C-alpha cells in the first residue's frame, strides 16, 4: 500500500484551491463563517499572517491583529469550509518564516520591519488584467 | 525510546562525530579503501556517497559545498577530475562495505572494509 497516498486520497474530497497564496508578513482579510444565534454570519478578521504551518491538507496559518487595544491571534485551517474567501490586503516581506517577534514590537517598529514587498505587489497588479 | 530515529551516535558528541565522518571521508577519497569498525563503515557510506554525487554535478557550487567537509583542494580536484567521472552513469552506490573475518585483538572490534566502487 501507499499509506501517504491513502491519506492524500481521504483528504482529497476536502482540499481547496479557491484561496489566494500568501506569505508571512502579508496582511490578509479572512472572511470566516461564524455562528451565534439564531443565525450565522461572516466575520471579517484582518491582520498579518505571522506563521504558515505546512502539512498539506492540514496546513494552518496564524494571523495577528489589534482589536481595541488588545492583541488577538487566530489560527485557521487553510482548507476550512468556514472561510468564505481570503483577501490579500497587503504584501509584506520578511527575512524570516515565523514572525513571532512582532508580538514584542510597537506598531512603529512593525511597520519599519515589514515593508511593502514591491515585487509581489507588482506581481499582483501585473496578472490582475484579464480578457 | 528511539522510534524512527536515523543515525548512529558512536559515543561521540556532535562535533566529534562530524569530524569523525569528515576525516574518514578524506581517508577514503584518498586511498580508495580503508578498514574500520563495521558500524563506522556503515555510516561512512552515505556521507561519502553524497560528496561524490556533488562531484558528479561538478559545478562550482558543488565544489565549495564539498570543500566544507573535505577542506583539501587537491583532494577535491581528485574527486572532480579522477573519482567522479568513473560514476557518470552509476546512480547511487558509489561505496561498498564488506565485513572482515578476524576481530581486532585488543578490544574485539568487528572490522570491515569500505571502498569506492569500480
Amino acid at each position: 500500500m501507499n499509506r501517504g497516498a491513502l491519506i492524500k486520497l481521504v483528504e482529497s474530497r476536502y482540499v481547496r484551491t479557491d484561496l489566494p497564496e500568501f506569505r508571512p508578513g502579508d496582511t490578509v482579510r479572512v472572511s470566516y463563517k461564524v455562528k451565534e444565534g439564531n443565525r450565522t454570519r461572516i466575520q471579517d478578521f484582518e491582520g498579518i499572517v505571522i506563521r504558515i504551518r505546512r502539512n498539506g491538507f492540514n496546513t494552518t496559518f496564524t494571523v495577528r491583529k489589534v482589536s481595541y487595544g488588545v492583541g488577538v491571534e487566530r489560527i485557521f485551517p487553510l482548507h476550512s469550509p468556514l472561510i468564505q474567501k481570503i483577501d490579500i490586503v497587503q504584501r509584506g516581506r520578511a527575512r524570516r518564516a515565523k514572525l513571532y517577534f512582532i508580538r514584542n514590537l510597537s506598531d512603529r517598529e512593525i511597520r519599519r520591519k515589514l515593508r511593502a514587498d514591491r515585487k509581489r505587489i507588482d506581481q499582483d497588479r501585473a496578472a490582475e488584467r484579464a480578457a | 525510546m528511539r522510534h524512527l530515529k536515523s543515525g548512529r551516535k558512536l559515543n561521540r558528541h556532535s562535533s566529534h562525530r562530524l569530524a569523525l565522518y569528515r576525516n574518514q571521508a578524506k581517508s577514503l577519497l584518498t586511498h580508495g579503501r580503508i578498514t574500520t569498525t563495521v558500524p563506522k563503515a556503515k555510516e561512512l557510506r552515505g556521507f561519502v556517497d553524497h560528496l561524490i554525487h556533488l562531484a558528479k554535478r561538478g559545478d562550482l557550487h558543488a565544489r565549495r559545498l564539498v570543500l566544507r567537509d573535505l577542506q583539501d583542494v587537491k583532494l577535491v580536484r581528485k574527486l572532480f577530475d579522477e573519482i567522479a567521472p568513473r560514476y557518470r552513469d552509476r546512480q547511487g552506490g558509489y561505496t561498498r562495505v564488506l565485513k572482515l573475518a578476524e576481530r581486532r585483538r585488543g578490544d574485539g572490534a568487528p572490522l570491515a572494509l569500505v571502498e569506492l566502487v569500480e
Partner: protein, 122 residues
C-alpha cells in the same frame, strides 16, 4: 488557562485593574479556568473610588486568555493578556462597560450582557 495565583486584567469600568485568582469555581477541584469560567479573585490593584477596591474578594468570569482556546471548527484564538469581568451572583456584570474584545464562548455560557457590551466579539 487560569489557576490560583494568576493575575488577570480587569476588562470593565468597575474600578479594579488587577485581580489574583484564588479559586476556579468549576466543580470541586478543577485545575484551570478558561473563557466562560467563573473565578473568585482578590483585587490587587484598583483605581481610587470604584465599586470594587483593593482587598475585596470578588467574582469574575474569564473573558479572554493568553492560552489559545480550540474551537469545534478546528480553528483557535488567543489574546495578548488574561482578563476578566466582575460579576454578581447572577453572572451579570457589576460594571457598565467592558473594554476590548471577548471570546464568543461567553455567549454559549450565558454571559449575554458582557457580550453585547463588548466592543468586539471574536
Amino acid at each position: 488557562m487560569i489557576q490560583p495565583q494568576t493575575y488577570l486584567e480587569v476588562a470593565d469600568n468597575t474600578g479594579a485593574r488587577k485581580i489574583m485568582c484564588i479559586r476556579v469555581l468549576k466543580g470541586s477541584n478543577a485545575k484551570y479556568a478558561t473563557v466562560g469560567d467563573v473565578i473568585v479573585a482578590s483585587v490587587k490593584e484598583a483605581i481610587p473610588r470604584g465599586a470594587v477596591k483593593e482587598g475585596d474578594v470578588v467574582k469574575a468570569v474569564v473573558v479572554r486568555t493568553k492560552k489559545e482556546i480550540k474551537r469545534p471548527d478546528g480553528s483557535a484564538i488567543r489574546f495578548d493578556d488574561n482578563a476578566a469581568v466582575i460579576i454578581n451572583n447572577q453572572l451579570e456584570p457589576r460594571g457598565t462597560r467592558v473594554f476590548g474584545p471577548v471570546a464568543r464562548e461567553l455567549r454559549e455560557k450565558g454571559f449575554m450582557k458582557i457580550v453585547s457590551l463588548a466592543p468586539e466579539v471574536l
